Subunit: 300 residues, 6 copies
């Protein structure tokens, strides 16, 4: 009746880390694809009456991983499991959370679609790390846990950056005001703001060190322009701390010929191959937070 | 089979205005209360096969108006109406859209509860003006229209404030960066930022005019502090433009003994009685936007 | 995993009585109101895995208490509670259980609306005392316990009224034939009947003591006229025993200038303030019945 | 897109009458049984886009007719029908509307089960004549039309009984007080009451004509004893008017050796064979009421 | 909290056998019929918190047994049982699993209707023996266990037929190729095929013994024709092994005047009365399979 | 209010054919992918009140196309469309329609998962061509049309194969008995059967022409072995007619080095690139059948 932990095809390293921190090991599931690109999920062990926990990040090929997660949840549910919990470090389609505004002709809400699919597959609980919009919690009818990576970010700032008592935290866009502001309050220091459309700046950032904080980085269209503007303004050096490092498209190329002292990300998305092609990127372990959340859910 | 428009106990003036702009008149419904404070809804005319439209703002006593709206929707649905649309100028419980963060011990999500109540009552469409969080659109499975009052705000700024070409727009909090930023871009001028915890300010605001823009004002705990900070900083005069003016609690007392040149709001919440006790308050009609949205929904 | 009992803003005394009879104490919940008349519910203790019981009577301001109950149930459900049970001593909107007849134009069914609201909020069980219509049990898909206060009424009749062996039991209306008939059968005594539209009487009621039995009294529009008719017919004195004493509107004034020897009610609705302004009113404790029902549900 | 009327195996005569009053004819459906007592439903004509009406009374073998109705509704729904309406003159399992009281060990609520069956089969509207409990309207989430046969009963009383101005109306049980009372009020005449457990009577019934009114008669366990008590009390003759005459079990034998001047019923249940073995039974047509209800639903 | 086993009106013998194999006895339930052919279900013992198991075969009068099963499940669910499991040895309406093809005018899918009825009644698990179509598992959203009687068929073939090493297995129709083929592979011997429309045969079946295997036999319209064709072809003797022996309509008459050496069936449908009028029929116990499935579901 | 036809990324040619046969043209939708492999759906025109028809085959990368279809349906539904119909020429995950048998450990039912996802996305109708299992019709609660390509197969056999009056139709497996048998009856000729586990044959196929008929061919693991066995048995030439030609994995390599003079398939899956690398493959247009089905659904 105790925890049975399962892992998907994507991001095996974090799954192994979370299993180790729980003093367990991943269950026997073979997730391959048939000849015509159809997902094949075969659970080897018994899940009857167990508290199944599935960890599947929204990275790599998003649709294939999402389909694998749904099929795994359905298979566990039909196999008479007590309660199936889906742990999603990076929620897929989390940037499509609104019907947008004037101009976006009949755009859908893909986040609610994913929520409905997870609910109809048979999920009983959702664990997510640093959702793009905290209001996505309301997209479900089951409990949702929105974990935060801010304590790790503060710890990294304190330990690594020696001048953290006289720095500033800068938001690369207008919507990152809340996160940047909360971090600045936590470190007991001031902050600035940057907006595009071009680049505008409101803050001191003169002969001091600035840290760019954002939730994610897909193509680094942001953060890079913010670093350029900050360097033009008078900043001595610029750091970049991120929660979900996608680094898709050009990305790595842009960081490589950039003046970032360090680009900091977390385990939520595999960074192994990305770190090889870029020395700036550094990784922060968050497996402890997910493991503690899993324990809190399980014991009760 | 054409539009049948109904009005609630709250905000009769806006309902009459919307009816006039539609070249119609409100249906015959008597909404009183029984002896033991229970809602009594009696629809006098036939709604069979009609496109029923109900306008009920979340103002005054929130719970009583919400229950009246739900009972009216249920009565219209059981009476074999073709499609029932709920027009809510101010969405109740819109500030409770998250499970908050560390410290808020097991707080609920009241916005999703209201969404579920409206869905189970029998609503087929929702029309809302300037939702507190745009992601509340995903709280429903029926279509939701999130109207914007920004064009009226811009028009008022242009017509009334003569120095609008050399002003700035200031957000009283960190979460208002997006709205203020969009308004600044539309007016082709710059912007500033104010954060509490005390007040901190990043911007020029020296010997010029600043306009405070926020989504709503419950007790004017904000906006007033921002005006004080701006006046201390060097602003010649401070304006305040708002979408939903609750003006609850002390409110009117605070604006009265304040240095606001004008506090601008919209129809969405009845401002009749409030305007009598405060000369600063001015109202912007938004009935045309709701009427146009209703026409767009109906015609198809 | 044992019982966690919660109480609402209305009827604190009955909640404390039920808690005492269960050898427990009410959980730590702070239920206040925000500035704009919106309910604030904050659960202080952990409800994860607990079998939560919420007691919220439909008295006072009905809509406000109902919204309080719904928000509390939703908060308990989202907080990973094992099972949430709503104990409602007086079911709100219980008199609106039909679509009425010819004349009531498009009247709704508010009882089914409340049932759907409780079902969608997350309630797993319902405990009610003396429902207005027993068929309201079918308004839910979850189990519903319809308790009966008849044993307490019989005990009061036996102990207090010394001539209970040669009395009669009179129904103030046509719909109360079943309750009056069952009480008369259980007491092994005869009965009468009264119908309005004016007053008509079929029974003996000549130089004997008559007892009026009804389910509830909102304004005492009934019962008072029944006592007048009984006194006109020849009854020496008239008693009145009720389950749910609303005593709204004039009520207390009518009883005060009436010839009731005693007006007997039960705990279900707070009678503290009402009893002060009227000496005739007497209260029968029903906390033991609710406590026993709660124990029966919990143990299993 | 106009009315397409269908008929079940039970009660072909009433279906043909309703079709004639609508100036239409029943659709081509062959409803036979396979070898192993399984219902076979084959719709011969096209129902795509039509507003189908199905008439299936709960008479004869109840389960077989109910399954026929459900299969027919499902077949019409899957065949892309616009809206399917189930016209049930006598609602099956209408006497099982409560979980009863102390003594009935874990009895079910079959009426809600039938309601759920009809809702899940695909019914969009329900038309019923004189439901046993009017609160069964709340057992559905679709609109329910509860027709009344009282005008026909009153017309029969006026036309046939010549002394209707100086009669009385008697309820054979305690639960029939409302119907008897309303009929007495509408006829501007007084009333009496009878309760079992044995027979007790409260009323005049001395050298006058008494009429027994009930909703239904299954075995005539009631009504017969009421007539015996009335004859003992002094009634010159006793009439009996009923809405749904089941006349199951002994029934016909009991009426045959009884002193009823006439036993009046309505069409809702086939009375052809029953009337042959008993001269007292007379039938009142109700096809016009159902036809008018169907027209009212269809036109809109 | 352990197993509470209930039995329906049909097939008492199999229920008693399954109870004996589980070392238990059937619960106290009285399932009779009211006067007007309505099902009466009264559960005598407590099912609160128990794992209720109901065995009800789709035999005899199908509709009455199905309604009894649904009412029993609903009664057990409303009585606060932990989990209700429906054990259906023969799934009713299992041959209506498709909307057929060109010619069948708007036929329904009765199997999905039965599935929806069982789901809405409150069933949490389904156990079925040898479904007509294995895809009926997808007709439910709850887990469904499709047991197989093939091991018993193979054992009977080995024990009774001494020449089973040099026989063939023949399918009476085209749709039985899979079952016959699997049996042939398991017995390490060859197979043949027979198709109607008349009879056509592809196989050796010359001066040897053939066994006809099908899923069921309603009227023995098949199997008898296959035996005639096989005997004409050169088969020395013909056997017939079946899972669900309905033997409805003529049936027994056809087997009696046939050249079958033995017609083998299983318990799933009561064969007691049928076996008396036909010496060829033999029965294979399958109570152990159902008992083992029940134990597997319960233990977990 | 008339037909608005939309097309997905996969199978543009068939969509254009169906649009041409309907005398219309495909709507303006841009279906691309964001940087991080997330589907981007933007509808350019208005679908309010329209009867949207979306054609999306389950070919190529299955998961991406399925996600595109779901997002398109959701976008059309939220945009206030009258009715959204999904036309799926090849149903994805149609081979996973059972929970298999002993040996497949806790395998899921992916077809029911896809059905649930389509139902929850907002689909109102499903049109599919030659489903793998006809019972998948019961996997939905909305109407499902299972079109058949058999008339085209018969026409091709008649026109192209000149010796079709003295041929045989052979099933490459045991489960294809029904299709092969129906085709043989339609052409008024005989048939044979082939089963693996190795290869076994029952039929004449001696100096005559044989045609292999199956529903689909993924890797041609079947059909090729059947052709080898048929050639070894004595067949002069062997043909192969298929409905859904996947031709994944090796496929083309197997057909090219085989003795097939014709491998006949239909449009449902794009055959353009496949036909270039193999001269044997030939294509049959089925756009007329889909267009006629669409018309039949639309007009009604
Ligand atoms: N995976 C993705 N990659 C790139 N753009 C995306 C992706 N998903 C959504 N988008 C687009 O990005 C926009 C969201 O931008 P964002 O900065 O979050 O808006 P906001 O200013 O409201 O925060 C949406 O309009 C959506 O069309
Ligand atoms: N009607 C109300 N009046 C006052 N406070 C409210 C009301 N509804 C919710 N709140 C509280 O106010 C907070 C919302 O503050 P807000 O500034 O919108 O948060 P955020 O910083 O996420 O924007 C919530 O935590 C909630 O507890
Ligand atoms: N809280 C209330 N106060 C006063 N009247 C009410 C209340 N709720 C419902 N009603 C009205 O009272 C009527 C029910 O009266 P009642 O005597 O119970 O009906 P019945 O005659 O069927 O018993 C309904 O028609 C409804 O309109
Ligand atoms: N078809 C039927 N035939 C006989 N008795 C029934 C039938 N259906 C239900 N019953 C029983 O009759 C009782 C209902 O009797 P009724 O007099 O209507 O109750 P009440 O006294 O509440 O009016 C129920 O307890 C039920 O067990
Ligand atoms: N209880 C029944 N008795 C006789 N025939 C039935 C019964 N239920 C369904 N049928 C009919 O029998 C047909 C099923 O025949 P079957 O041989 O199973 O079809 P298939 O060729 O698809 O296997 C269905 O078309 C249905 O109309
Ligand atoms: N896309 C696919 N490619 C290859 N194999 C599959 C695919 N989808 C399902 N399967 C497997 O193929 C099996 C179905 O084989 P099939 O011949 O249809 O079985 P049956 O003999 O019941 O018809 C399933 O057990 C499933 O595990
Ligand atoms: O793709 P790039 O520009 O790196 O980042 C996309 C941005 O879009 C927003 O949702 C996030 O805040 C993120 O910063
Ligand atoms: O109550 P006061 O301080 O006036 O305003 C409450 C604030 O809380 C936020 O949700 C809104 O942005 C609003 O400005
Ligand atoms: O409001 P008053 O006249 O006191 O009482 C209302 C009556 O209406 C009925 O539902 C109850 O039986 C109650 O007696
Ligand atoms: O079965 P019999 O005694 O004829 O009648 C049953 C009675 O039970 C009540 O629900 C009805 O009012 C009906 O009169
Ligand atoms: O009624 P008879 O011909 O005996 O059998 C009916 C047949 O129809 C099919 O579903 C079964 O395979 C069964 O063999
Ligand atoms: O992948 P190959 O062997 O070509 O074909 C797979 C087979 O599996 C069955 O569902 C179909 O009948 C098909 O013939
Ligand atoms: Mg009353
Ligand atoms: Mg009665």
């Amino acid at each position: 009746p105790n925890i049975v932990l399962f892992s998907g095809s994507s991001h095996q390293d974090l799954s192994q880390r979370v299993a180790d921190r729980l003093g367990l090991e991943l269950g026997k599931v073979v997730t391959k694809k048939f000849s015509n690109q159809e997902t094949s999920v075969e659970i080897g062990e018994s899940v009857r009456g167990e508290d199944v926990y599935i960890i599947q990040s929204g990275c790599g090929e998003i649709n294939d991983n999402l389909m694998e997660l749904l099929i795994m949840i359905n298979a566990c549910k039909i196999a008479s499991s007590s309660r199936v919990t889906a742990v999603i470090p990076c929620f897929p389609y989390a940037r499509q959370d609104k019907k947008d505004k004037v101009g976006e002709s009949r755009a859908p809400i893909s986040a609610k679609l994913v929520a409905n699919m997870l609910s109809v597959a048979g999920a009983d609980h959702i664990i997510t790390m640093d959702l793009h919009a905290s209001q996505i919690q309301g997209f479900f009818d089951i409990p949702v846990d929105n974990l935060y990576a801010e304590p790790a970010v503060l710890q990294w700032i304190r330990e690594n950056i020696a001048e953290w008592k006289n720095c500033i935290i800068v938001s690369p866009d207008a919507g990152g005001a809340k996160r940047v502001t909360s971090i600045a309050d936590r470190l007991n220091v001031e902050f600035a703001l940057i907006h595009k459309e071009r680049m505008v700046l409101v803050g001191d950032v003169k002969d001091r060190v600035a840290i760019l904080v954002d939730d994610m980085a897909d193509t680094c269209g942001t953060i890079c322009h913010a670093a350029d503007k900050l360097l033009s303004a008078g900043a001595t050096k610029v750091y970049a701390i991120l929660t979900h490092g996608i680094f898709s498209g050009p990305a790595i190329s842009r960081i490589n010929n950039a003046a970032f002292e360090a680009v900091v990300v977390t385990n939520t998305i595999p960074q192994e191959d990305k770190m090889k092609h870029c020395t700036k990127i550094q990784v922060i372990d968050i497996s402890m937070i997910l493991a503690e959340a899993i324990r809190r859910t399980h014991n009760g």
